[PDB]
Design an enzyme around this catalytic site. Structure first.
Site, PDB file in Angstrom:
ATOM      1  CD  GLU B  88     -33.108   9.633  -5.004  1.00  0.00           C
ATOM      2  OE1 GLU B  88     -32.925  10.876  -5.014  1.00  0.00           O
ATOM      3  OE2 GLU B  88     -32.461   8.851  -5.736  1.00  0.00           O
ATOM      4  CG  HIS B 185     -29.800   7.846  -2.378  1.00  0.00           C
ATOM      5  ND1 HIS B 185     -30.414   6.630  -2.609  1.00  0.00           N
ATOM      6  CD2 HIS B 185     -29.381   7.819  -1.092  1.00  0.00           C
ATOM      7  CE1 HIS B 185     -30.384   5.909  -1.498  1.00  0.00           C
ATOM      8  NE2 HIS B 185     -29.762   6.609  -0.562  1.00  0.00           N
TER       9      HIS B 185
END
Ligand SMILES: O=C1c2ccccc2C(=O)c2c1cc(S(=O)(=O)Nc1ccc(C(F)(F)F)cc1)c(O)c2O
Ligand SMILES: [Cl-]
Lengths: 233, 234
Positions: B88, B185
């Site tokens: 992420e 992500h």
């Protein structure tokens, strides 16, 4: 000294570990899963850290590894899977319980197989319920004809496990990577036999416990400096 | 088409429920996020999908999503590769703060500037940040060079460190004929989608990938999509 941890998976579904599960891809039972959780928690309590993990391509071992990595909060570790760490292939006996095995083959021959290092069971034939299930599983699609067993002696199992040990695992250990291996009784037997220089008779009498971290301390030549140790209580 | 690529964005995490910025903090899936992954996996199973190799980040919400999918499609035996480059976006000093704390400290104005920006990073995660050692000193990043380990990332930064992994490690596998699954992500996957579709900065900033749902690309030999992304399920 280097540190190596082995773990043998626990109970599989439908009592398959008492039915020559072999290359059939039996999942862990809930109890086998719990065993793996307890092993993972033992490793967590003792503060163990790993750098790389090896396992077979069989889901009962893979799930054991997953459970352990989860428990020790190291799900991010690199994981390498190989058919060479698979359970022994029990050929035509795969899936049979003790009574069925004795009924089909006789107590004499079963005694011979049980005590022999290089006599395989009969081959898994096309009429065996697991024949296409295993032999045509695409996880073995890249294996050559000699590599994909129809059956294995313990000698055969150890013979195809040790090249992976030598070529892929040993270089990691000598680089100082802390290795975890999650696998099966007979492939782990191969590794233990190589490490401790055990006789054929000795390795056949050695029964590694399930769900318990097995710890080795190895010197510069990858010789154990003391007997294998177990984690937990 | 010649190739097929499947992406999946992980679902709800424990910090999503707390409204907290996770970024590189290794928050686990919530039960609901885990169920989302199960449903995605079942969609892939029902459609008969087969893979040859999987890529994911070094964050457990993505890894556990991958595990859940592999379990559902009975392909736990597949090779799996993990990389920080699929992590992420790193939210820097905002990491660990919830919505209220962030607006209170910085003003919804400054939050306006950050979230509508492609290339303005949040403030850096400094040594006195409560998650500084938890993330920056995590041994999973021990091999990153000094310049590689972010203190914060704009979306541009995130995409800039995700695309090298795509080009150098994933693309060659695809052209080798491997059927690839990527579990990762929102923002790292945005990097990949932006590269695949040649999207503009504003376009990629307006793109919100759905969670827990298999995203299918049909690609030609040059890895150009031949049609829009498709979602699997009911
Ligand atoms: O009959 C066999 C046998 C027959 C043919 C090839 C290999 C073996 C074999 O390898 C074997 C056997 C019996 C025992 S035993 O009774 O002493 N413990 C045992 C172990 C596993 C099973 C299981 F059925 F679950 F596989 C059953 C019995 C063994 O330990 C064992 O290794
Ligand atoms: Cl894995």
């Amino acid at each position: 000294a280097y540190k190596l941890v082995l773990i043998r998976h626990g109970e599989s579904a439908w009592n398959l570990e008492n039915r020559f599960s072999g290359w059939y891809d039996a999942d862990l039972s809930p109890a086998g899963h719990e065993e793996a959780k307890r092993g993972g928690q033992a490793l967590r309590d003792a503060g163990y850290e790993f750098d790389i993990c090896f396992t077979s391509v069989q889901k009962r071992a893979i799930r054991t590894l997953w459970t352990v990595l989860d428990a020790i909060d190291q799900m991010w570790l690199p994981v390498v899977r190989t058919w060479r760490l698979n359970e022994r292939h029990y050929g035509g006996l795969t899936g049979l319980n003790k009574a069925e095995t004795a009924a089909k083959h006789g107590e004499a021959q079963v005694k011979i197989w049980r005590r022999s290092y290089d006599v395989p069971p009969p081959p898994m034939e096309p009429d065996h319920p697991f024949y296409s299930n295993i032999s045509k599983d695409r996880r073995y699609a890249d294996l050559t004809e000699d590599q994909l067993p129809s059956c294995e002696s313990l000698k055969d199992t150890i013979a195809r496990a040790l090249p992976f040990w030598n070529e892929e695992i040993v270089p990691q250990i000598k680089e100082g990577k802390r290795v975890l291996i999650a696998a099966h009784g007979n492939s782990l037997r191969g590794i233990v036999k190589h490490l401790e220089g055990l006789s054929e008779e000795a390795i056949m009498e050695l029964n590694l416990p399930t769900g318990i971290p097995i710890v080795y301390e190895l010197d510069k030549n990858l010789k154990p400096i003391k007997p294998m140790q177990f984690l937990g209580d």
